[PDB]
Design a protein around this ligand. Structure first.
Ligand code: NAP
Ligand code: NAP
Lengths: 316, 313
């Protein structure tokens, strides 16, 4: 008798949302024994080699003594790094072509919202004002993308194909057809000097927290507009409000915030130059994500291969 | 006291390696990394030696005269630096031609000698010999008959393959069937069992190998892309691999490099991913070529032949 391995589903989602996930995972991984952490006895916990996680309680993972690796269901991993790094087990984030497709679409959709003056036209409508605003071509309009990763590079390609003059920024050098790529801290402020619409798709780390502070925001040309699809703490909220109120930044589309759901007292809900979205730019698709987890687990069972994991020292 | 700026986004170790080779080939010249020059020293630069430079750095060399790339491919230089109107000199090097012609034959053999099928059998613990047919019975097509493409067609010819080549204007290559013009591409592709791409990326070659052109290849044809990623429609390629119409693809070049982790190419059973290594620039030979060009400029004022921006390659 040699106990076979099992999988713990470890989340702090609602019971309904966790059940939805369970069904999708069970269908994608039909040969596997997958159970909610709370359903396992102490002896069953010792049989777990893989945890599938969604905002897991880190104390639960510490009670899986033979855990080998961890699969998250989200692209962002800053809290996993902070809370689970000490267990020294590989953390596999979600990398999914469908997530990339969806985010790249979002990036273009909300770049268009800003570019085509949709907020100004909405304000005019409320005022019963009929007034056409001047148009300038995308080829004359510089769009900057911060982050050229699974999501950021995909976004730069959609924005390129829409005809924008696209500049991208990342930590290490990239080559992206039809996109001007910049790398390193040393080139950021120069890049920003040129950017009329700025899209943020960075991960949150010690190095990106507060990147878009008063100084960096002041690098943007007058009337520049910003889209934050990354994490709230990358963009200094106080500095953003000052820049909006001084007329130096024209508008901000914010999908991510320090506290979610955004508290009712936030000035962002009522600011005339802010568009609030409830963290929906690129929602995980449970079908495609489950099939990816499924393939990763199958490959592990077949060959011992653990998928690419987060470098803790890098932080993403 | 003119000086030379070395402008790259290579690693510090690779750029230092290059700097040593250039310093040896150009002993009388003051060559420094762009990041080491003060604003005043930047004003003394008349020549930039470049390898994936940030274009904004070149825009800060106000008395720049001309630019020498260390790479054969120039499409980003054209797009990003064309506006400065300084001559762009691409790398043409017999050793680069030799290396790429070698790569073309090496990876043609990888396909021809069934190396992927044998690797799949090995993973399955299956012992099974596959039928062999002579190279003289296998048609190989080369897209691009330039510095690299013609050299590749000659190596393939000499290995005994039945070689067809395609370019914009007519060529005569002994022992090779040469086709020219858009009008002859689809007819050529109809005959090709292994297709090697050695075109430059331009407005005219982007998306050349789309669903329609890929459908011209005979069933089971195999492809080698050593040109640029955008020349080959990725979605169309995957559909052709999955339908069984294309047998295998060796891909060295992609629209985004490094290839994103989400790319279907990494995991596809009928795809071999190479990290843009088919023909790396040889720092010794390329340095001696840059050296001779700079020396001739210092001696006579001659700027070497440069890229025609309207032509795009
Ligand atoms: N709002 C939503 O609905 C939503 C949904 C999903 C994800 N997200 C967010 O999107 C982020 C990106 O996801 P992803 O999968 O694209 O991540 P990823 O593949 O790791 O890419 C991250 C990119 O950011 C760059 N970067 C990181 N630190 C940097 C620094 N200090 N300086 C300059 N560039 C730096 C990286 O540079 P290198 O390439 O050189 O490593 C890389 O290009 C997530 O972390 C998450 O916060 C939001
Ligand atoms: N993967 C790697 O490591 C690597 C390394 C080096 C180079 N490369 C790639 O290899 C490419 C070729 O280099 P090269 O030195 O051979 O260039 P080249 O000497 O300029 O030759 C280019 C060839 O392509 C043909 N061509 C260009 N546009 C065409 C079109 N629209 N239709 C048909 N034929 C067309 C040219 O026709 P004509 O003869 O009529 O002018 C010529 O035969 C580079 O641009 C680079 O992208 C890749």
């Amino acid at each position: 008798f040699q106990s076979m391995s099992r999988i713990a589903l470890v989340t702090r989602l609602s019971p309904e949302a966790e059940a939805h996930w369970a069904g999708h995972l069970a269908r994608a991984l039909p040969g596997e024994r997958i159970d909610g952490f709370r359903e396992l006895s102490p002896a069953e916990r010792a049989e777990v080699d893989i945890a599938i996680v969604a905002n897991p309680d880190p104390a639960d993972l510490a009670e899986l003594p033979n855990l080998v690796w961890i699969h998250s269901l989200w692209a962002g991993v800053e809290r996993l790094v902070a809370e689970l790094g000490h267990l020294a087990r590989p953390i596999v984030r979600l990398v999914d072509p469908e997530l990339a497709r969806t985010m790249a679409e979002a990036a273009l959709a909300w770049t268009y919202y800003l570019f085509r003056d949709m907020p100004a036209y909405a304000a005019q409508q409320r005022a019963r004002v009929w007034k056409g605003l001047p148009y300038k071509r995308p080829e004359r309009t510089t769009v900057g993308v911060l982050g050229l990763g699974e999501l950021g590079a995909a976004a730069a390609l959609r924005l390129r194909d829409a005809g924008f003059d696209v500049h991208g920024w990342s930590r290490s050098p990239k080559e992206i057809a039809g996109v001007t790529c910049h790398a390193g801290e040393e080139t950021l402020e120069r890049m920003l000097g040129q950017v009329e619409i700025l899209v943020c798709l960075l991960p949150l780390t010690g190095e990106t927290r507060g990147l878009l502070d008063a100084r960096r925001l002041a690098c943007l040309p007058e009337g520049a507009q910003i889209v934050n699809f990354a994490r709230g703490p990358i963009l200094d909220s106080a500095a953003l409000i000052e820049a909006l109120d001084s007329g130096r930044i024209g508008h901000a589309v914010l999908d991510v915030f320090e506290v979610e759901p955004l508290p009712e007292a936030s000035p962002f809900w009522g600011h005339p130059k802010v568009t609030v979205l409830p963290h929906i730019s690129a929602a995980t698709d449970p079908e495609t994500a489950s099939a990816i987890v499924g393939a990763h687990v199958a490959d592990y069972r077949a060959t011992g291969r653990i998928p690419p994991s987060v470098d803790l020292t890098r932080g993403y």
